């Protein structure tokens, strides 16, 4: 009931037996023959890239609004998977995002953990455009805001419109999980590869966005540690590439 998961000869994650969300209903898989357009063979690096990339922990405070990571840029420096994003041209990968919190029984709160395919985001200034430096950092989260952002080339990071101009309660349409600290502790979503082409270049394109939004805010009394660490762990699935060359950049 405290079963350990070992993925590759480097990683150990301890986890109890809970519920998973599998994509839009499909497991990630390898490309078959009547699915691709490229003129070569994939040569998937199964022997080295399937492991757990535990990112840094964020602190769910009382006054926090939400965080998002864009993928696959979220593993740009994470080990050999970041090297394959350099020394290739096309790529195709599913992921198994596992999100878990360490709260006591005297904490309360609720999170919504969404995976949004093609989460294109609007800018904080109309009649203007975003830059790539405001969409995502390479490994750290990007914070939503309670109030209105007002920059020139930034993102409209207000929390109830989710950066996309929609209702934040309707993000339940995409693959999601609720971390309710009363009963739930963890959340694990298995995203497949969703695109309109069989393989895309994973520098320009953002395949999906992992959003973690607190709907019921965190409350605690005065004895308690005044944050709950949220730890995200991403494991790539069935990664395969094409176009061996040098790194650009660098």
């Amino acid at each position: 009931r405290v079963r350990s998961i070992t993925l590759g000869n480097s990683t150990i994650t301890t986890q109890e037996c809970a519920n998973v969300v599998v994509g839009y209903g499909v497991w990630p898989s390898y490309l078959q023959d009547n699915e691709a357009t490229a003129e070569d063979q994939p040569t998937q690096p199964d022997v080295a890239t399937c492991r757990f990339y535990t990112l840094d922990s964020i602190q769910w405070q009382k006054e926090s609004d939400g965080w998002w990571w864009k993928f696959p840029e979220a593993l740009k420096n994470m080990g050999l998977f970041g090297q394959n994003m350099e020394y290739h041209y096309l790529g195709r990968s599913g992921y198994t995002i596992h999100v878990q919190c360490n709260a006591s029984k005297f904490h309360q709160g609720c999170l919504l953990v969404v995976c949004v395919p093609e989460a294109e985001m609007g800018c904080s200034d109309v009649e203007r455009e975003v830059v790539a430096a405001s969409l995502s950092s390479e490994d750290t989260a990007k914070s939503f805001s309670r109030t209105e952002s007002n920059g020139q080339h930034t993102v409209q990071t207000v929390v109830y419109n989710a950066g996309m101009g929609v209702g934040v309660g309707n993000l339940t349409i995409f693959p999601h999980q609720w971390i309710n600290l009363r009963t739930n502790n963890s959340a694990t979503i298995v995203m497949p590869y969703i695109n309109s082409v069989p393989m895309d270049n994973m520098f320009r394109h953002y395949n999906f966005t992992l959003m973690i939004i607190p709907f019921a805010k965190l409350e605690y009394t005065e004895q308690a540690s005044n944050y709950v660490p949220i730890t995200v762990t991403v494991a790539p699935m069935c990664a395969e590439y094409n176009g061996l060359r040098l790194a650009s950049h660098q």
């Binding site: 840094d56 919190c101 360490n102 006591s104 005297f106 009394t221 004895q223 308690a224 944050y227």
Partner: protein, 59 residues
């Protein structure tokens, strides 16, 4: 007894989230470590322990 630096391995530990406690629980805590051998363990070439320095007999 030899020191091959950068030829042994390191076991480090990092904070991921922190330590979340309810009101009433102590915020700081304690870890204990326990080391042993495994089934594939073996030794060879017995000698004297470096720890005991006394040489002359007791009294």
């Amino acid at each position: 007894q030899q020191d091959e630096y950068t030829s042994a391995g390191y076991v480090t530990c990092w904070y991921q989230t922190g330590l979340i406690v309810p009101p009433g629980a102590p915020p700081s805590c304690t870890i204990l470590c326990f080391a042993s051998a495994c089934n594939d363990f073996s030794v060879r070439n017995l000698r004297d322990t470096p720890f005991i320095e006394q040489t002359q007999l007791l009294q």
